[PDB]
Amino acid sequence: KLPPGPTPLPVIGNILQIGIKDISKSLTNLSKVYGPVFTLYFGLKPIVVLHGYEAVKEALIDLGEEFSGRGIFPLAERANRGFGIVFSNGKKWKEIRRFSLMTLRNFGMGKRSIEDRVQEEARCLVEELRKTKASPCDPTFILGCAPCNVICSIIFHKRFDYKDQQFLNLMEKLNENIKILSSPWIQICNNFSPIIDYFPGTHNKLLKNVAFMKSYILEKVKEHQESMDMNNPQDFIDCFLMKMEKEKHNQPSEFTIESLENTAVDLFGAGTETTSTTLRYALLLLLKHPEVTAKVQEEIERVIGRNRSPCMQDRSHMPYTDAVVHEVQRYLDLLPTSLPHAVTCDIKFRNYLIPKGTTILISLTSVLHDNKEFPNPEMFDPHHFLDEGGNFKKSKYFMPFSAGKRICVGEALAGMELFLFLTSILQNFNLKSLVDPKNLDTTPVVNGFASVPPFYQLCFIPI
Numbered sequence: 001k002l003p004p005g006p007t008p009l010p011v012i013g014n015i016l017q018i019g020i021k022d023i024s025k026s027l028t029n030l031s032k033v034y035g036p037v038f039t040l041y042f043g044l045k046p047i048v049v050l051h052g053y054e055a056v057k058e059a060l061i062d063l064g065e066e067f068s069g070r071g072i073f074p075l076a077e078r079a080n081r082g083f084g085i086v087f088s089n090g091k092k093w094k095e096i097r098r099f100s101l102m103t104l105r106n107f108g109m110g111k112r113s114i115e116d117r118v119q120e121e122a123r124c125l126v127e128e129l130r131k132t133k134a135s136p137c138d139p140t141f142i143l144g145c146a147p148c149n150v151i152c153s154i155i156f157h158k159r160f161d162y163k164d165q166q167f168l169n170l171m172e173k174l175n176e177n178i179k180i181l182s183s184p185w186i187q188i189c190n191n192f193s194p195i196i197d198y199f200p201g202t203h204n205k206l207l208k209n210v211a212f213m214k215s216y217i218l219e220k221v222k223e224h225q226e227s228m229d230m231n232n233p234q235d236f237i238d239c240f241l242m243k244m245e246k247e248k249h250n251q252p253s254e255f256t257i258e259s260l261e262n263t264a265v266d267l268f269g270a271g272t273e274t275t276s277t278t279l280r281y282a283l284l285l286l287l288k289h290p291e292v293t294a295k296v297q298e299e300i301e302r303v304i305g306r307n308r309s310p311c312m313q314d315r316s317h318m319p320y321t322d323a324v325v326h327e328v329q330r331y332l333d334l335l336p337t338s339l340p341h342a343v344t345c346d347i348k349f350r351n352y353l354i355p356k357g358t359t360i361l362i363s364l365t366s367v368l369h370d371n372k373e374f375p376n377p378e379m380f381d382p383h384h385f386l387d388e389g390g391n392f393k394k395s396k397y398f399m400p401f402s403a404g405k406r407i408c409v410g411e412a413l414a415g416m417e418l419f420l421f422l423t424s425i426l427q428n429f430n431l432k433s434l435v436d437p438k439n440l441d442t443t444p445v446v447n448g449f450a451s452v453p454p455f456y457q458l459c460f461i462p463i
C-alpha cells in the first residue's frame with residue numbers, strides 16, 4: 001500500500017497539523033516518528049515524503065526515471081506555470097530540458113563563453129561597488145542585478161547598465177512576482193482549493209508581470225530573427241531559433257516561440273532569485289566570521305593576485321574558498337524541500353507501492369543537515385568541506401541543487417556566479433559591519449518554504 005503516515009482527518013487530511021511556518025522542521029519532526037518514508041495528505045492528494053540520504057538517493061538516483069516527474073499544484077495552472085522547464089513533464093520537459101542543458105554548456109552559444117559573460121559581470125559588480133565610495137550600503141539590490149544581467153546576457157546577448165530604466169523595470173516585476181510567489185497564502189493555503197482561485201487579484205498581478213516580460217522577450221526575438229547568422233549563434237534565443245529551423249518538418253513540435261518565451265521566463269525566474277539570495281547571505285556570513293573572509297583573501301592574493309580577474313581554473317588551487325562556497329549553500333538550505341516531484345508510473349518502493357502520479361517531496365534539509373556527514377550541521381563551518389590537511393573534501397550529501405534527472409539546470413551556472421562574484425568582491429574589498437560582528441543574526445528567516453535573509457548594511461572598503 002502507501003507508505004504509512006500519521007492519520008489524516010476526513011477531507012482536511014493531515015493539513016491542520018503541519019507547521020506552515022516551517023514545514024521543513026515539521027517533516028523532520030514526523031520523520032522522528034514514521035521513519036524515512038511517510039505519507040501525508042493535502043486535502044486529499046497523497047504526498048510521500050522522503051527523508052534522509054538513503055531514501056532520497058535510491059529514489060532520485062536509483063529510481064531516477066520513475067521519480068523524474070514534477071509535482072503539479074493548482075498554482076501551476078493559476079499562474080500559467082507549466083510551460084517551460086521548471087513546471088513541465090513528459091516529452092515537453094525532456095526535450096526542452098535537454099536542449100537547454102546543451103545550450104548553457106560553457107561554450108554552448110558561440111565563441112563567447114558563459115564564463116566570459118560572468119567575468120564581465122563580476123567586473124561591473126565590482127565597479128558599482130566602488131561607486132558607493134565605502135559608505136554604508138544595503139546590497140540587496142545590486143546583488144540582485146548581477147545575476148539577472150547574467151541571464152540577460154545568456155538570452156539576449158545584451159547586458160544592461162545598473163541604471164537602465166528598462167532593466168530596473170524588469171527587475172521590479174521579477175522581484176514582485178518572487179515576493180508574491182513566496183507568500184504562504186499563495187504557495188500552500190491556496191493549493192487546498194483545487195477548483196476555486198481565492199486570490200484572483202494576485203494571480204492577475206502575476207500574469208501581468210509575466211506578460212510584460214514575455215512581451216519584452218518577444219521584442220528581442222524579432223530583433224534576433226532579423227539579425228540571424230546561422231553560423232554564429234550568440235545566445236539562447238539564437239540557439240532556440242536554430243533548433244526551430246531544425247524542427248521544421250517535425251511538427252507538431254515542442255520548440256515554438258511560445259515555449260521559448262516560457263522557457264526564458266523560467267530562466268529569469270530561477271536564475272536570479274536563488275543566486276542573489278545566496279550571495280546576499282554569503283556577505284552576511286562573511287561579516288559574521290571575518291576570519292573566514294581573511295582566509296578566502298589569503299587564498300585569493302596568493303593564487304590570483306590582483307592584476308587579473310578570478311576565473312574558474314583558480315577554484316582547484318583554492319580548496320578553502322571552494323569549501324566556503326559549498327558550506328554557504330549547505331548551511332543555507334535555501335530550498336529545503338527542493339521542488340515537488342511526482343512518480344511517472346506505478347512503483348514499488350521499499351515495503352510500499354506508490355501509484356503513478358503521487359506527489360513526492362524531497363527533504364533536502366535532511367541531506368544537507370545530516371548530523372553525521374556534517375557534525376553540528378546547524379553551524380556555519382567550512383571545515384565541513386575540508387580534510388585533515390585542508391584539502392577539499394567532496395560529499396555525496398552536498399545536494400543544494402537536488403539530485404537525479406531533475407537536478408537544477410543552473411547548477412554549473414550558479415557555481416560560476418558564486419565563485420567569481422564572491423572572489424571578485426573579496427579581491428577588491430574588505431567588508432565592514434555597522435553593529436558588532438558578534439551581534440547580528442545570520443540564521444535564515446523562512447516562510448512559505450521561502451528562505452530570506454534579514455536586512456543589514458555594510459561598507460565595501462577598497463583594498
Ligand code: HEM
Pocket residue numbers: 070085086087097266267270271272274275278334335338339340400401402403405406407408409410411413414
Ligand atoms: C544557488 C542557486 C540555485 C540553486 C540552489 C538552485 C536549486 C535548484 C533546485 C533545488 C531545483 C529543483 C530540482 C528538482 O526539481 O528536484 C532547481 C531547479 C532548477 N533550477 Fe535551479 N538553482 C539555482 C540557480 C539556478 C540558476 C542560476 C538557474 C539558471 C537557469 C536555475 C535554473 C533551474 C531550473 C530551470 C530548474 C528546473 C529544473 C527541472 O525541473 O528540470 N537555477 N534549482
Ligand SMILES: CCCCc1nc(Cl)c(CO)n1Cc1ccc(-c2ccccc2-c2nn[nH]n2)cc1
Pocket residue numbers: 198199200201202203204205208
Ligand atoms: C482583480 C484584478 C486586479 C489585478 C491586479 N493588477 C495589479 Cl498591477 C494590482 C495591485 O493590487 N492588482 C490587484 C490586487 C488586489 C488585491 C490583491 C491581494 C493582496 C494581498 C492579500 C489578498 C489579495 C487578494 N488577491 N485576490 N483577492 N484578494 C493582489 C492584487
Ligand SMILES: CCCCc1nc(Cl)c(CO)n1Cc1ccc(-c2ccccc2-c2nn[nH]n2)cc1
Pocket residue numbers: 079080081086173174177178181206207209210213265266268269270273274339
Ligand atoms: C517576471 C517573471 C518572474 C518569474 C516568474 N513569475 C511567474 Cl508567475 C513564473 C511562473 O513560474 N515565473 C517563473 C518562475 C520559476 C521559478 C521561481 C522560483 C525562484 C526562486 C525560488 C523559488 C521559485 C519557486 N517558484 N515556485 N516554487 N518555487 C520563480 C518564478
Ligand SMILES: [K+]
Pocket residue numbers: 200201
Ligand atoms: K480583489
